[PDB]
Amino acid sequence: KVYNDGYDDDNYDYIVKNGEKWMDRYEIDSLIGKGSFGQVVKAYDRVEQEWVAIKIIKNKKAFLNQAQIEVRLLELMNKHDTEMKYYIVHLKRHFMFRNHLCLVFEMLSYNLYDLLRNTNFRGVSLNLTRKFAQQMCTALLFLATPELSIIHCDLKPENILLCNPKRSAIKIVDFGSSCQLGQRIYQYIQSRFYRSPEVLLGMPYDLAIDMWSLGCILVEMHTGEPLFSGANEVDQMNKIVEVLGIPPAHILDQAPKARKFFEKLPDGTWNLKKTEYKPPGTRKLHNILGVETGGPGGRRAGESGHTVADYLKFKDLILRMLDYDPKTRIQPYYALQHSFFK
Template identity: 30%
Template sequence: MAQGASFPYEEVAEIGGGAYGTVYKARDTESGKFVALKSVRVQTDQDGLPISTVREVALLKRLEQFDHPNVVRLMDVCAIQRTDSETKVTLVFEHVDQDLKTYLEKAPAPGLSQDRIKDLMRQLLCGLGFLHSNRVMHRDLKPENVLVTSGGQVKLADFGLARIYSCHMALTPVVVTLWYRPPEVLLGSSYATPVDIWSTGCIFAEMFRRKPLFCGESEMDQLGKIFQVIGLPSEEEWPKDVTVTRKQFLPPNHPPITDFVPELSEQGAELLLEMLTFDPLLRISALNALEHEYLKEEETADTEESTRESEAVP
């Protein structure tokens, strides 16, 4: 981690803000290439940076050695001491011009083809499987954090940041979208890597719908909307370590998932429901999802059409 050296990046434009502060597009003054900068102010003591921050950054740097095609590259980490008790840590990532949200908005009507969606899902799950096998949870997966290059390559961004930022959040009001959060997080239960699979299921449905599947206005409202789609879990499935009770929800008369995502095939609907399984222990894993029949069928067919389509979306 570069400590206090001259900062070789020149900010060009603000490209987004979120739970973790502002993201800037910048130019590397040495190479001239564009990068994305994400900074956090970390409280420090006499020993320097907190060990938790150093550990998380070291993990992200270690992942970088694998150079996975579906994970955004962490190119540099700069730490500049601002005061005796505060250090500004800036993570420097490769810059990708658009995210999946923009990509879906730009797709000409009636939207992406089945083959293109399958290709995007395979890439997303490949990146996620890689993170999970290295014990990294994303925890904030949504279309804005899935980048798509001009050539149609998917790259996961902002993974691991939740852990780095959680203990050192600036005291500013933060609005984190509920729409991609799994039931165990909404209920305040314990959670692990299946949280990301739930979010991926929400994104999968959104690729067809071109709008989010669950648009709750509060945590309880979000849970209610989820149960309208997947049904109310049984008392046995309900987690024991939460204050919200099952009795607070009326059993909905939930229609089949294809009523919400009509373009889905039978195999696709099966995969989606395996991702949107209430019990995280029963939720499909990223690597098993990649082996699902839906993503394996016609894997090699229509690659030319898929490539043409990815080039047609700017």
Template identity: 30%
Template sequence: MGTTSSSSADDSCIEDYKFLSRLGYGGFGDVFKCVDKRTKKIVALKVSNRPWGLVREASMLKKLMDHKLDQCNIVKFYNSFGTDRCLVFEPLDISLKGHLAETKVVMQLQDIRTVIEQMAEALDALKKIGVIHSDVNTNNIMLMDRVRPFRVKLIDFGMAISTCSAEQSHIDHGYSNRAPEIILRLPFTEAIDMWSLGCVMGKMVVGSILFPGRNNYEMLQYIVDLLGLPPAHVINVGSESRDYFTETDSQHWELIEYWGLRKSDNRRYTFRSLDEVITINKSEADEMKECINLLKAMLQWDARERIIPSEVLAHPLITRSYLNKSSSLNNCYSQIKCVVPRNEVCLVDVGNMRMALWPQFPSRAAPVQTSSGQQQLWQKEFVLQNLFN
């Protein structure tokens, strides 16, 4: 079944579908699992309960399908009917939120990588055609099935807008994934989707919502607690920044304390730095370091410094380039073991040894060179364990 034109879509009617079950619901209406009686195929039918229907979403979806974005991890839209009150999609399995609720455990890093890579591809495709999704969250990321590696799709374009109209648009999605520029009323771009994806990634990594604020003020408190204060230039540009921040006598900004606004802490974690997550999860340490590195890049206060989708796809967590460095290190150690006989003591110029091997590891900070001719007595195992400490 392919995307049909609006004229042929109008020939469809609700009687053409056999309803099997209700898949979900929201402020827009309901989503049903149905059989298209004409093609005998399973479809998902989104039915609006609003008089004006789903006109804006239908128009955006047709644009996405014209660009074949269903090939970029975006839900496939078939057609609409009933004056755009009914939208027909490919069937999907379960939302990421539903999957996390079912498993009740922190996602494996390999699964996190899979989801983030596919969502970065989706956001990259949207960026190229000038579209902002505006509501990236765990409800709007769907698993196609439950077979690993997971295949996921981005859904719900009811709040999607064109990049060119971003400054004039008012975004009112859920608090927990809301970017700072939306809270502080700065001009915004598709970078708000990357912040939201970072919040999704945080939930997959930690197992709970990073910023579970119930209003903008609580959101800012949680963000400041975890990421620190925003840069001064971000505060200065926000039209509503002074509702939340005040300038001190020393010309520094601080969050205003509104007594009684936060009577309880909704966070289910105790760390106050993303770096602490690395120490919590000591297994797969190298991969976790890259994971947190990417998460930090997604959650930048300044949207201009936030990582973009194409850069996510080139990040070491996605490319797994850190495995090559680990392999090179192991090969290096193996070569040393061949040079130094077992159970023997040898003289090693530590500084020269480090500098000779260092070009193979450009990502590390350069070690301090020992003074010329300095030699120390090292046993083989001590050299191997401390060569790059």
């Protein structure tokens, strides 16, 4: 009949009313997001005199504990990044309000998916793409700090926000899927389109999965459409194979889930199972990017910084991010020294 003395709905969510003031401090403006965790509101901090994004976690033990896991990782990252130059969203405070854990973040702007929607999924320039790429690579180098060793585990355009709607600076959000490098506990991880081959194949993984995800993201930012839009894992892996070919044999011989996608022939070589798809490696990135045809769909023909030479540098960096082998896949430090950023 009544939940949390009337403050909650039947689904454990705080009922957000515009104009409330929590603790004589946070003036609640409006709802700016929601999900299974709970809600996100726009609120004015009266003490600090600034807008904030406040994440109100559901009044439910399971979501409360997952939120505290993220708080620990956010506070751990704040100790290593005062001055805030490695592009991770700043958690500035948390408190309990009417049996809800409230996490106070800095107010950011639109996410990179919204931005893509605003271009009607036709992409943004190689110049803006490069700026995002550098910041994201720098951010991955900071996660790679030995004392952190944090896998985000869910990089995608909706989890990268602009700081200011009129600047190109970005921050990474949502460390709810994130963990520190350790023994393998989880196997169904990452959002399908940005899922890495080692995770699809059921194999050991590390911080390299985030670099795979970044490769996929950057091509999407420039094209507008996801690179590998699988409706299921078998479709996902087939779309990777269209572009990058059959994975190397030394990987597939290890893979527990290889037979979900492939068949080991009597001579010990691998090919696809029948489920449609272009032959292996015949949908070349070179043509998806439009290297010699004026970029994706010809729309960058004659734009500054979209020459063939510029496109081959972008292509080369991306193919290093989409290495099937996570041991030889490009790492943050050397991605930053790639010719694409000079």
